[PDB]
Design a protein around this ligand. Structure first.
Ligand SMILES: O=S(=O)(O)O[C@@H]1[C@H](O)[C@@H](O)[C@H](O)O[C@@H]1CO
Ligand SMILES: [Ca+2]
Length: 487
């Protein structure tokens, strides 16, 4: 049995610049402030992806990962928590559609749910031992998708409906009182052994993952580990292991705490890489590093710089269709298959992870209930072909997040070659950016290139109708907002 182990190491709310590893053309101030030596170690042994995309919010990205569908299709287009409860902020002008706020599942029977065959279920069915560690956030509370075991994971460390965490601190029981009562729906479950200890949640998850990997080695099976950090999500607890030195770099209390979440996430990566090396698994293990959306840039309560700049040189952040919200740090290591110290700037979307992971696992034939929108990036990894040649990428956010900002709320977009069109459902406004010429999306070229705006509007409208995508409605009329090619 020559099949590789696979680790998908997913960070929460980590931006393109939330690392010491430069994904841009030079080092930023952020690359010089943050410390991720194990990300640099991973890049030295693998391939960096400098144009990797997600959706701008946890739920659409993670539902796209586990089902291999574009967010416009699965309609989980804002964050989930409570059953049958839209998290959208009310708007004066527009109503959000009746979107899939219960999330995803593998089974029929529940309203407002997208049903899809899990790639993790296919891995398990093929004989992989499957481990979930950390943030799940696939289904609302009291829906079958809330439980990682529903997805085909045999082991669950700390995964549930919630896409946040009540506390990073062992001394606060990760959000339980002294009686063990949860302080909120975000309380982190299954870490009772660490309650009352000076163990940061990132460290506890790593220690539990390593226990599960020691078990995995005894089982005589290839393993799949989804190492899904709760870091670096708010609230910004400080990790006292790392905090003092960021204050000496002149960072604010919040920004120094943020840096400590990054460094602890990087220590977790390093601890798993160390385990692979010591256990003799490193030569037959794939590591995929990814983040689920851009760095938080729209909440002055948590972030201290000029708002909407926390992913500079990218514009905006979490919740935005601008690069700051959707462009993610991504690395793939696969010893003897992927060239070490390589870079790939060809674009891809999170749903592409689904067929790629099954291909890595040698699963050449599989049945799914849903169409798979993902396209394998195996040819990018092997440097053989660009599977995204002439490919359009699509985003749909007919929703209202908790914050306003540049490229946030009630919009959809298409990326094709150098060009990105963003359409605002409420106003009919169209922004056109040349991403390589203008990576900060500061120069709207829509008036200068009406033929490009027309071509991309048709592509965007056609795609959204093809996948039965949703749009907001105008409160005044009850009529849906026009598709971009109806303008
Ligand atoms: O899941 S996330 O999408 O990352 O985060 C959700 C949302 O945007 C955040 O504004 C909130 O604070 O936490 C939610 C947890 O689910
Ligand atoms: Ca997130």
């Amino acid at each position: 049995d020559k099949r590789p182990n696979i680790i998908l190491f997913m960070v929460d709310d980590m931006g393109w610049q939330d690392t010491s590893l430069p994904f841009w053309t030079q080092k930023t101030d952020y690359n010089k402030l943050y410390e991720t030596p194990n990300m640099e170690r991973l890049a030295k042994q693998g391939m960096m992806f400098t144009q990797a995309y997600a959706s701008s919010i946890s739920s659409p990205t993670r539902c796209s990962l586990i089902t291999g569908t574009n967010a416009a299709r699965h309609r989980v287009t804002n964050w989930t928590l409570q059953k049958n409860t839209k998290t959208d902020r009310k708007d004066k002008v527009l109503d959000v559609p009746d979107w899939n706020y219960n999330g995803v599942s593998q089974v029929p029977g529940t309203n407002n749910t997208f049903v899809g065959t899990s790639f993790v279920q296919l891995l398990k069915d093929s004989g992989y031992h499957t481990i979930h560690c950390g943030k799940a956030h696939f289904g609302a509370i009291d829906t079958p998708g809330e439980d990682p075991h529903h997805w085909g994971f045999e082991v669950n460390i700390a995964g549930h409906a919630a896409g946040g965490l009540a506390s990073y601190l062992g001394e606060e029981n990760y959000g339980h009182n002294k009686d063990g009562k949860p302080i909120s729906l975000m309380a982190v479950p299954g870490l009772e052994k660490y309650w009352g200890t000076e163990t940061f949640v990132t460290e506890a998850l790593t220690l539990e993952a390593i226990k599960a990997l020691n078990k995995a080695k005894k089982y005589n099976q290839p393993f799949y580990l989804y190492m899904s950090q709760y870091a670096i999500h708010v609230p910004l607890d400080k990790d006292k292991r790392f905090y003092d030195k960021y204050k000496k770099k002149g960072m604010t209390d919040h920004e120094a705490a943020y840096a400590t979440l990054i460094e602890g996430m990087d220590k977790s990566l390093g601890d798993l890489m160390d385990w692979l090396e010591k256990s003799g698994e490193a030569d037959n293990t794939i590591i995929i590093f990814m983040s689920d959306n851009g760095g938080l840039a729209a909440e002055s309560y948590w972030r201290d710089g000029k708002l909407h700049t926390q992913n500079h040189p990218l514009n905006s952040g979490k919740g935005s269709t601008y690069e700051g919200g959707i462009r993610e740090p991504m690395i793939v290591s696969w010893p003897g298959v992927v060239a070490p110290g390589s870079k790939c700037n060809d674009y891809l979307l999170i749903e592409d992870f689904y067929p790629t992971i099954l291909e890595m696992a040698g699963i050449k034939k599989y049945k799914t209930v849903q169409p798979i929108d993902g396209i394998s990036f195996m040819p990018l990894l092997k440097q053989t072909r660009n599977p995204s040649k002439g490919r359009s990428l699509f985003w749909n956010m007919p929703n209202n997040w908790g914050n306003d900002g540049p490229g946030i709320n009630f919009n959809c977009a298409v990326r094709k070659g150098d060009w990105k069109l963003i359409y605002y459902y409420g106003t009919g406004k169209k922004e056109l950016f040349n991403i390589p010429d203008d990576i900060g999306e500061s120069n709207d070229l829509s008036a200068q290139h009406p033929d490009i705006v027309k071509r991309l509007s048709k592509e965007l409208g056609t795609y959204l109708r093809k996948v039965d995508a949703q749009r907001p409605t105008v409160k005044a009329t009850g009529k849906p907002c026009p598709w971009p090619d109806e303008i």
